[PDB]
Amino acid sequence: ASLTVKAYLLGKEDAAREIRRFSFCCSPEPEAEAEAAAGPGPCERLLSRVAALFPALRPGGFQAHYRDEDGDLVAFSSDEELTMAMSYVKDDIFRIYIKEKKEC
Amino acid sequence: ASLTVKAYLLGKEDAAREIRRFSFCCSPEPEAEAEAAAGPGPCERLLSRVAALFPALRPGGFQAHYRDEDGDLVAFSSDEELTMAMSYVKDDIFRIYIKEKKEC
Amino acid sequence: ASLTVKAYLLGKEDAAREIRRFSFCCSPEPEAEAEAAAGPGPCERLLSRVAALFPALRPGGFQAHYRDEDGDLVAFSSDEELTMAMSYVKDDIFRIYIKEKKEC
Amino acid sequence: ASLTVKAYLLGKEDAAREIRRFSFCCSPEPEAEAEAAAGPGPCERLLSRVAALFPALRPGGFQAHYRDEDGDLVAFSSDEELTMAMSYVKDDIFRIYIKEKKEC
Amino acid sequence: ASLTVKAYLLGKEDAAREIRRFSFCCSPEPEAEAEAAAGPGPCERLLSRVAALFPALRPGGFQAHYRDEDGDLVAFSSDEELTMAMSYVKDDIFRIYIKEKKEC
Amino acid sequence: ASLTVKAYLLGKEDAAREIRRFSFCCSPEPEAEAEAAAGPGPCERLLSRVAALFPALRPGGFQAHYRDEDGDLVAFSSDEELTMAMSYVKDDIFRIYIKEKKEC
Amino acid sequence: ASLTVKAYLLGKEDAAREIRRFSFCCSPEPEAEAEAAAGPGPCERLLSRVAALFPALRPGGFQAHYRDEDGDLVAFSSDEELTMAMSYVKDDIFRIYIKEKKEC
Amino acid sequence: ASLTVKAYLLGKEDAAREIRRFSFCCSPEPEAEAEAAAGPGPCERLLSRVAALFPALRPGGFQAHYRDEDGDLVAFSSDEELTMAMSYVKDDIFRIYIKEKKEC
């Protein structure tokens, strides 16, 4: 399941500041034997890869979102919630919206 | 009865600060034999799950609401009152409005 | 006679602080034999149920009101006066206005 | 694989200020023995050549982009991302869009 | 079940031309023995009474409506559909909207 | 599965001429023994009921539609296609759009 | 591979006259043993299903198209050409455009 | 060298009547040993494949063209002239223009 993720980085008034467009492999998985318990999570591997590409942000300091049917930026941080996020993929493009974690 | 709950977290002037959108299983219930008296309540399981998702709040310190026909944020804390709250579900989306418990 | 009571709790400048919206069963009554003299009163059962729902008030320390045709908050504490209060029900919603009993 | 790169240098309101049009040799490679580990990268050789031609910019201080199917200026800085950039070549012209790195 | 019917007679651009406000006795019924099969229908008695009051219309030549939650003038002509019309009564006022049957 | 069908009857420029709003029982079914092969179809029972309510149309001479995500009036006449029509129900309201079968 | 086909039927000035929206199973295939040579073709099964749904056309008398990147209605009739047609699927919707075979 | 050929079939006033868009393998060639003298020619294989796809024409009765820099439909029938035709390929699309051979 080759899945393209188009990571929007949002700015001041929720206008996009930098777009990245990488590829992601959620349903694919490594070798079918346990070298660990079971890897990282599918949302933990996503946020580890969004943090690796953008130079403008550091890992652990950003909140990834998506747009639902109402147009609202629904956040996601879990991997049982990333599966609800990915039911909104249009063609193969999973558009996420990155916002940084400021003061309050 | 798969039931989607869209938890709005309200801010200063009752504007939404963070939206979460999980799923909830009120009318479904576990195995039909008593390992306890009867579980937690259907409102106790709801507020235990709203507190588990949001990192910005801690359990026991938030008041969940809903909008009635007048547009007012009617609160609910009981499970005989959650059944009156859930007669306002539109499609399958049960929109609740979370407010934190401050000083006075 | 299923009758919905929307209990407004008034605040500083008679602005509503918490709304509750329960259901009430005035004209319905229990089994048609005397286990007591005749229960509590229909206003005594109302004020016992308004005190049970709100955590912010304690029983015996609040004055329930209603709005008449002039817009004035007419109080009621009797059960021969609750019958005059309930001649202002609009659809099935009996809006009462709760005020607490302070110093003077 | 002779590949023409048409380097647009963008200005104030993303209008082109200077166009350069050089040639690039991504899939071609030098002698088939290791005088080093493996050269520079195919994106490192591209940005070293865009910086060599334009007198108006200095190396390390510009962000190269491309247009995707949505019309958005998707940036690229990696060489596993330059391979996704180059799947948008039209005839043999790989149009990149240069933007300088200002204050914030 | 005393039920007030406020019959709006609509005009050119669906503006009310004459309002009548009578009373109606749907759930009440005559003597509990069959002098006929079972009377007229509860919608047949309604349209026979709307035609009796208005001098501007003649029976069989008008279409009675109601407003649903969307604001649309939903028509009704059956008595299994009048029961769905009467689930929109607000206090005890059942507002119907009369339109005459013209050419096409 | 109580399911409300709001039958729009379209006019000249696809503007609604008469709206009907009945109820429909697709997934419910009669007694669990065969008095026939298996009844009519779930789309055959729907179009038999839309034709029964509207006086302005006669059975066999109308095409029922629905709106998909693109806003287009997708027609349906089969009962393996009515199941795809009914995946667009919003709350419990299944809005169909009736058009009559004219010359060409 | 569940694949939705949205069959536009074109009219006089290539404006759509009737839209159908069925589902298609190209890459899925029946039991893995030969009851025949190898079924019909994947384009022969498509045109047999488009002809089965539309009442306005008869099989063998219509030309199915698709839109390429230029906006042109490229026809297809082969099954080595249907595989080039299906590289333009957007989400899972394979929009074909039906035109009938008239005089000349 | 995968090469896409978009075969326009021209009509009365040189307006396109049917477009076909197949793929062609000019510079690729079969096994590197002589089962014949040397196959057909690269223009003979092209015109044998254009005649195989279009049902509206028969082989030997059509003239394939291309557009040069002046906008003129330059014909080609040789395979030392097809190599001059294919120096006008834009991305990988080799647009030819088919005209049938009528009376005079």
UniProtKB/Swiss-Prot annotation, chains A, B, C, D, E, F, G, H:
Annotated spans, Interaction with LCK: 1-49
GO biological process assignments: aggrephagy; apoptotic process; autophagy; autophagy of mitochondrion; brown fat cell proliferation; cell differentiation; cellular response to stress; endosomal transport
Top-rank taxon, per record: Eukaryota
Result for mutant: residue 70 to A: No effect on interaction with PRKCI
Result for mutant: residue 8 to F: No effect on interaction with LCK
Start and end residues of each stretch annotated as Interaction with PRKCZ and dimerization: 42-104
Description of post-translational modifications: Ubiquitination by UBE2D2 and UBE2D3 increases its ability to bind polyubiquitin chains by destabilizing the UBA dimer interface. Deubiquitination by USP15 releases target vesicles for fast transport into the cell periphery. Deacetylated by HDAC6.
Disease linkage: Paget disease of bone 3: A disorder of bone remodeling characterized by increased bone turnover affecting one or more sites throughout the skeleton, primarily the axial skeleton. Osteoclastic overactivity followed by compensatory osteoblastic activity leads to a structurally disorganized mosaic of bone (woven bone), which is mechanically weaker, larger, less compact, more vascular, and more susceptible to fracture than normal adult lamellar bone. In a cell model for Huntington disease (HD), appears to form a shell surrounding aggregates of mutant HTT that may protect cells from apoptosis, possibly by recruiting autophagosomal components to the polyubiquitinated protein aggregates.
Entry remark concerning the domains of this protein: The UBA domain binds specifically 'Lys-63'-linked polyubiquitin chains of polyubiquitinated substrates. Mediates the interaction with TRIM55. Both the UBA and PB1 domains are necessary and sufficient for the localization into the ubiquitin-containing inclusion bodies.
Protein name, entry field: Sequestosome-1
Native organism taxonomy: Eukaryota, Metazoa, Chordata, Craniata, Vertebrata
